[PDB]
């Protein structure tokens, strides 16, 4: 996947 962040 491109252009996607991460939340924790």
């Amino acid at each position: 996947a491109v252009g996607i962040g991460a939340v924790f």
Partner: antibody
Framework: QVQLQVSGPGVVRPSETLSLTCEVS??????????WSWVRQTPGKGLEWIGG????????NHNPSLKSRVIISKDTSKNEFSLRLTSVTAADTAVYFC???????????????????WGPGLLVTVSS | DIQMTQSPSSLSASIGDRVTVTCRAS??????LSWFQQKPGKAPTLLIY???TLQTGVSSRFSGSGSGTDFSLTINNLQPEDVATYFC?????????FGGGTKVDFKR
């Protein structure tokens, strides 16, 4: 303003600079980062991804059809994710959206999921 | 660039019908394909991601399949909230691109 709600002028004259802002927020942990995107919708061309950036960085990704007219920015001080479209023409009349994309790594028992949310759009018309 | 062709452009169906929209990428997009639902005045809402993963909160009446080049969205027990436009979104590479969209309309 709700999350990812777009604000700015609804009418721009041709050759002028469309400028929009988008309501964004920080994550709940200091490690959280989102991918913020400008997308637009027209009747004929449908949906078109204008460009985007990570909240982490200063780098921008673009659509090759628009890249040299697009300035994508952030101002955390005002909780703003901004688009500036220069050299605007009538072809740029559209509904403009913001989207936020992030993978979910909350836990060893909840992971791999994702958030991909769009806020309410704003109609911007280009005419004199 | 990578473009997604959706079929059919329009679809009319009855309550309870199983309906299918198809999308293909101009290249392999291995699994990086999402399905969105858009009601007329609203913003698109995520239904499926990674081509088959149902997003939390979306009814299991929506299902997704496919890989590589060919993908499908299926709505099984069609309900009044399903009248909308449905788009596929490729997130395999920049720029992100969308299918032309499919309207689901009610037979009468």
């Amino acid at each position: 303003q709700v999350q990812l709600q777009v604000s700015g002028p609804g009418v721009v004259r041709p050759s002028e600079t469309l400028s929009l802002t988008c309501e964004v927020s920080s994550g709940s942990t200091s490690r959280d980062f989102f991918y913020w995107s400008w997308v637009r919708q027209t009747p004929g061309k449908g949906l078109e991804w204008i460009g985007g950036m990570y909240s982490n960085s200063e780098e921008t990704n673009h659509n090759p059809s628009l890249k040299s007219r697009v300035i994508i920015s952030k101002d955390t001080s005002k909780n703003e994710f901004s688009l500036r479209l220069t050299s605007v023409t009538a072809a740029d009349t559209a509904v403009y959206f913001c989207s936020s994309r992030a993978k979910i790594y909350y836990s060893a028992s909840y992971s791999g999921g994702r958030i991909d949310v769009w806020g309410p759009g704003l109609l911007v018309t280009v005419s004199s | 660039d990578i473009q997604m062709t959706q079929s059919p452009s329009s679809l009319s169906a009855s309550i309870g019908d199983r309906v299918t929209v198809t999308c293909r990428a101009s290249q392999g997009i291995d699994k990086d394909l999402s399905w969105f639902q858009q009601k007329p005045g609203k913003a698109p809402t995520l239904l499926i991601y990674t081509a088959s993963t149902l997003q939390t909160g979306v009814s299991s009446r929506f299902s997704g399949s496919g890989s590589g080049t060919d993908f499908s969205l299926t709505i099984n027990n069609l309900q009044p909230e399903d009248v909308a436009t449905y788009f596929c979104q490729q997130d395999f590479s920049f720029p992100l691109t969308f299918g032309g969209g499919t309207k689901v309309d009610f037979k009468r």
